[PDB]
Design a protein around this ligand. Structure first.
Ligand SMILES: Nc1ncnc2c1ncn2[C@@H]1O[C@H](COP(=O)(O)OP(=O)(O)O)[C@@H](O)[C@H]1O
Ligand SMILES: Nc1ncnc2c1ncn2[C@@H]1O[C@H](COP(=O)(O)OP(=O)(O)O)[C@@H](O)[C@H]1O
Ligand code: SF4
Ligand code: SF4
Ligand SMILES: [Mg+2]
Ligand SMILES: [Mg+2]
Lengths: 273, 273
């Protein structure tokens, strides 16, 4: 068995930093993990690979001829803790549909046998500002059974969480895609933990972890590393280890209850944000 | 003559607050303005209308039958300073293409004669996290000659500015869409103004204004108002008046020079952000 898991959220909220650090903690635990980057920014694997980024399936298929000319062993790259890494890529701005590379990438990985019996987790790191095209494919096509949404007390971040939840509800008649939790990536504001707990309760899920704001993240990323690898003794490393443990142990996977904009504003007003 | 102008930027960066306050300052000056909301969040006109939001063209067309059953005089709504307001709307998450309502809305406004000779400015408030579908239409179809990008010292915000600039370059062989400036919406960090000035220079444009972070914005928006209307004596009101004056006077409209990710990282490292 392998758990297929997707991290969604608005741009800049912390998806890639949280995913790579969570996955490094899982690898440190002994888990076998693959990360699939599903964001056109295409830097979702750089901290595992010690790299600038990673060349994308779209780019390598263009140089090889067709995606069928690619070999899986040439595409997947392994970094810290044996974590396997791939990036979808996407068309240039103003060309096509920004999510089209996600569809190509996931289908290629499935056909070529990337989902080996020994994997324990797959994490898709998915752009969440719009829920359409290839960005909706992990939900629409039943690729990620467990959705975790990174958010913060920011109204735009909560709105994105609600919109992703609406997408999960829309496709709940087939497949098994469920909301697994909210991850609060702190903005260092008062009552932010209480706010995200309250939002999670309204949606029917949980806050699985509150990740503090900590400059050690910037120091590790300047060096192209997760905090887990950069400073295994850091307080923040223990935070990502706590998140990883709770993901491993989580059994709450729900069809969420999306809320109104009125309810979002009321949450913001209540907790004096 | 009327100047057609579009405000782009990543989600949550300040597009709608900046646009509505800029436009209120223009109206206070004596200009006739229309705002066209091109973001599925659909709250781009609420501060002009004193409202929760505004019902969208997509919603009103569905209740009327077809978009052709709608009358322009039923759709456009006027608020503070006579500013005219409309919202595109868009499909629900997981359905279709998130930008499809923008195409319907702009075509409807053009066919029904909304671009009256007496207008001085039209501002489109456009989602900028992806540059595709209806979100690319103002650029691809030559609807907004002057693009202003709201950004901040945040790396994701600068990346979005670069991606929008790539979209402008892609379509520069026809039409007349140009980059008019960057607007820095402050995160209250050191050297942020210098950073955005440097980014603008690399792209070939300018920082047209540095908007400070100021809690009066939240106090005005709780009351469904621009700062211009809520407290005309506020320091922040004068900031939006300065931005409006510089937009009126701006003559620099360029085909930008998009930069590499290496150059973005170097900018961030230089200014110690
Ligand atoms: N807990 C944290 N503490 C400090 N900085 C953080 C934290 N989480 C994210 N960041 C920083 O925030 C920025 C955006 O994070 P990233 O994971 O790239 O966002 P996304 O993938 O959602 O666009 C990065 O510079 C990252 O280093
Ligand atoms: N200069 C500012 N000072 C204080 N708060 C601001 C400022 N600009 C924007 N905000 C707040 O930031 C949040 C997001 O702004 P908004 O214009 O809705 O972003 P967007 O339209 O780009 O998604 C809102 O709560 C808004 O009140
Ligand atoms: S939103 Fe991007 S192409 Fe439909
Ligand atoms: S990105 Fe939204 S539909 Fe193409
Ligand atoms: Mg990312
Ligand atoms: Mg907005």
């Amino acid at each position: 068995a392998m758990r297929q898991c997707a991290i969604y959220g608005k741009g800049g909220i912390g998806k890639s930093t949280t995913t790579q650090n969570l996955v490094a903690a899982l690898a440190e635990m002994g888990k076998k993990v693959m990360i699939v980057g599903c964001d056109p920014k295409a830097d979702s694997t750089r901290l595992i690979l010690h790299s600038k980024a990673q060349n994308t399936i779209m780019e390598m298929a263009a140089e090889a001829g067709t995606v069928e000319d690619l070999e899986l062993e040439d595409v997947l790259k392994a970094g810290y803790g044996g974590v396997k890494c791939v990036e979808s890529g996407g068309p240039e701005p103003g060309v096509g549909c920004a999510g089209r590379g996600v569809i190509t990438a996931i289908n290629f990985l499935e056909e070529e046998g990337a989902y080996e019996d020994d994997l324990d987790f797959v994490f898709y790191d998915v752009l969440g500002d719009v829920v359409c095209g290839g960005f909706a494919m992990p939900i629409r096509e039943n690729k990620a059974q467990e959705i975790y949404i990174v958010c913060s007390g920011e109204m735009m971040a909560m709105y994105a969480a609600n919109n992703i939840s609406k997408g999960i509800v829309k496709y709940a008649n087939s497949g098994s895609v469920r909301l697994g939790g909210l991850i609060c990536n702190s903005r260092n504001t008062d009552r932010e933990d209480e706010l995200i707990i309250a939002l999670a309760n309204k949606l029917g899920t949980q806050m699985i972890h509150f990740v503090p704001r900590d400059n050690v993240v910037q120091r590790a990323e300047i060096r192209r590393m997760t905090v887990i690898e950069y400073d295994p003794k850091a307080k923040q490393a223990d935070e990502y280890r706590a998140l990883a443990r709770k993901v491993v142990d989580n059994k709450l996977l729900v069809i969420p209850n999306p809320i109104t904009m009125d309810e979002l504003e009321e949450l913001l007003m209540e907790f004096g944000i």
